[PDB]
Paper text:
Protein tyrosine phosphatases (PTPs) play a critical role in regulating cellular functions by selectively dephosphorylating their substrates. The ∼280 residue PTP catalytic domain consists of an α/β structure, and biochemical and structural studies have led to a detailed understanding of the catalytic mechanism (Barford et al., 1994; Zhang, 2002). Key features of the domain include the PTP signature motif, the mobile Trp-Pro-Asp “WPD” loop that in the closed conformation positions the conserved and catalytically important aspartate residue, and the phosphotyrosine recognition loop. Here we report the crystal structures of 22 PTP domains, including two tandem-domain RPTP structures and a detailed structural comparison of this protein family.
Also within this category are RPTPγ and RPTPβ, which have the secondary pocket with a basic residue albeit with bulky residues in the gateway region. The basic pocket is also found in the phosphatases RPTPγ and RPTPβ; however, the topology of the region differs in these phosphatases in that the gateway region is inaccessible. PTPs with particularly high enzymatic activity against generic substrates were RPTPσ and PTP subgroups R5, R3, NT1, NT2, NT3, NT4, and NT5. CD45 and members of subgroups R3 and R5 were extremely promiscuous and dephosphorylated most phosphopeptides with reasonable activity. All members of the R3 subgroup as well as RPTPγ were highly active, and it will be interesting to establish how this activity is regulated in vivo. Particularly notable within the RPTP group is the significantly different electrostatic potentials of CD45 and either LAR or RPTPγ.
Numbering used by the authors: 826 to 897, 903 to 1000, 1015 to 1122
The structure:
């Protein structure tokens, strides 16, 4: 209803009050929940899989990890299923792929029936490598049994959309929504561009398709921020009634560190407030 929307908007101001005391309290709770819960990630730590992780301390929880079909530890990718508002396994949250995991990455896309990739990092930021370029600059590239062809590109102010066709050589359209303006440090000054990106990339999800693949560099901070904004917008649209903190605690059981920073937690609320007022 209008009334629960009114209470949420008021709750946002509450969190902001007293030098953001409520936001800090909320996020400290989130971090403590993560610290206290024991969630295994044995596969991520297996010696054979160590080179498949971009970061030694960003793992894939066992219970929610995406499994690749075994090949004649070939089942491992640093990726997890993550819920959306009502829908189980609405997303696959994953790291920016490495050259050594490009074949695995595209095979996962294929096997999962994924039609949309959401990328929320530049390849290099402030001279530091954040992600390897897992797609062809032009024409086609073969990544094991998957051939990926770049059909077309549209470069907007804050995001780029690349339309691919992929084919398993042992054809499907896959669209990449690539946000290109996230700052080197902190969060975006203005939420509106991110809101537009979330709305357009989320609207691209078609019926009877697999999870939307979301990644940044580690696949935790910006990735989690996207998933929470998208999911809470969908909840507001359908139900009203938002529960950002409970949703975040829940997804944090599915992939380590989703929404990594308090600044991101606050940004989520800025973005939802802008959506509500717009
Ligand atoms: Cl499992
Ligand atoms: Cl991986
Ligand atoms: Cl890296
Ligand atoms: Cl979505």
């Amino acid at each position: 209803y209008f009334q629960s929307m009114k209470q949420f908007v008021k709750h946002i101001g509450e969190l902001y009050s007293n030098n953001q005391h409520g936001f800090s309290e909320d996020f400290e709770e989130v971090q403590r929940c993560t610290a206290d819960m024991n969630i295994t990630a044995e596969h991520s730590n297996h010696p054979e899989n160590k080179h498949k992780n971009r970061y030694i301390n960003i793992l894939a929880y066992d219970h929610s990890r995406v499994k690749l079909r075994p090949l004649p530890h070939s089942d491992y990718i640093n990726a997890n299923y993550v819920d959306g508002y009502n829908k189980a396994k609405a997303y696959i949250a994953t790291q920016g792929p490495l050259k050594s995991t490009f074949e695995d990455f595209w095979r996962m896309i294929w096997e999962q029936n994924t039609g949309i990739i959401v990328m929320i990092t530049n390849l290099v930021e402030k001279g530091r490598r954040k992600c390897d370029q897992y797609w062809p600059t032009e024409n086609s590239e073969e990544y094991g049994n998957i051939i990926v062809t770049l059909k077309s590109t549209k470069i907007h102010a804050c995001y780029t959309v690349r339309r691919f066709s992929i084919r398993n050589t042992k054809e499907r359209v896959v669209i990449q929504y690539h946000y290109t303006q996230w700052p080197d440090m902190g969060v975006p000054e203005y939420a509106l561009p991110v809101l537009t990106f979330v709305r357009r990339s989320s609207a691209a999800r078609m019926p009877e398709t697999g999870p939307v693949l979301v990644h940044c560099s580690a696949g935790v901070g910006r990735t989690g921020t996207y998933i929470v904004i998208d999911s809470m917008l969908q909840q507001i649209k359908d139900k009203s009634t938002v529960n950002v903190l409970g949703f975040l605690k829940h997804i944090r059981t599915q992939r380590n560190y989703l929404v990594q920073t308090e600044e991101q937690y606050i940004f989520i609320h800025d973005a939802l407030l802008e959506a509500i007022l717009g």
